[PDB]
Amino acid sequence: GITTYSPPTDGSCGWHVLAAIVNRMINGDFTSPLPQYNRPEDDWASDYDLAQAIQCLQLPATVVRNRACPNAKYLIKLNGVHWEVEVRSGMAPRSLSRECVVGVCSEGCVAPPYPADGLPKRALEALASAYRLPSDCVSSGIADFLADPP
Ligand SMILES: [Zn+2]
C-alpha cells in the first residue's frame, strides 16, 4: 500500500517533494504548501541538491536509482524528468546513512529507529525561505535558517 505525491510541474518539483514529506510528517498532509515557482530547466533541483537538503532537514528519505533502500520511509523518484515521492504508509521512519539517502546502499543495509525529536523545530519554514534561491544554494539557505530564525 503506497501513496505517491506528484508536485505541480513548475520546475521547483524537487523542493515541492521535500515540502510534502515534511508536511506529511508534521500535519499528515502529503502535499507541498509551497507557492508555485516557475524555474528554467538549468535550475531544476538535482539528485545532489535533494540529497544535501534531506540531510539538513534530517528526513527519512532516499533518492532511488536501481534498488530502493528498504529502510527508507519516503522514496524520491523521477518519472520522465519530474520528481515524485512515495510514502510507505505503515512503516516507522528510520534514520538513514548518507549511502541510504543517496540511493547507493548495498543489499541488506541497516538503519536505527528515527527519534521523536529527529525533525528540526521549524523545518518547513526553513525550506520556504530557501527554495526560491538557486537550486544549488537552497541547502545552505535551509541550514542558515536552522542556525538562527526570527
Ligand atoms: Zn539503505
Residue numbers in the entry: 417 to 566
Paper text:
PRRSV replication is accomplished with the help of four virus-encoded proteases–one of which is the papain-like protease 2 (PLP2), located within nsp2, which processes the nsp2|3 cleavage site to release nsp2 from the rest of the viral polyprotein. Subsequent work demonstrated that several arterivirus OTU domain proteases hydrolyze ubiquitin (Ub) thereby downregulating Ub-dependent cellular innate immune signaling pathways as means to evade host antiviral mechanisms. To this end, we determined the crystal structure of the PRRSV PLP2 domain both in the presence and absence of its Ub substrate to a resolution of 2.85Å and 2.3Å, respectively. Overall, PLP2 adopts a similar, compact OTU-like fold similar to that of the previously determined EAV PLP2 domain, comprising of α and β lobes, as well as a structural 4-cysteine zinc finger, and a DALI search indicates the PRRSV PLP2 domain most closely resembles that of EAV PLP2.
To begin characterization of the PRRSV PLP2 domain structure, we determined the crystal structure of the enzyme from PRRSV Type I strain SD01-08. The SD01-08 PLP2 domain crystallized in space group C2221, with 2 copies present in the asymmetric unit. The 2 copies superposed with an RMSD of 0.635 Å over 144 Cα atoms, with unremarkable differences between the structures. Residues 385–415, representing the N-terminus of nsp2 following polyprotein cleavage were not visible in electron density maps. In particular, the α-helical lobe of the PRRSV PLP2 is comprised of a 4-helix bundle as opposed to a 3-helix bundle seen in EAV PLP2. The PRRSV PLP2 active site however is made up of a catalytic dyad formed by C429 and H498 and lacks an obvious third coordinating residue. Additionally, in the apo structure, H498 is positioned away from C429 in a catalytically incompetent conformation. Although unusual, similar active site conformations have been characterized in the OTU DUBs Cezanne, OTULIN, Gumby, OTUB1 and TYMV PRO. Structural regions surrounding the active site of PRRSV PLP2 show a high degree of mobility, as evidenced by higher B-factors in these areas. These regions include the β3-β4 loop (residues 493–499) which contains H498, the 453 loop which extends toward helix α2, an active site loop (residues 422–428) extending towards the catalytic C429, which also forms the oxyanion hole, and the 480 loop situated near the Ub-binding region.
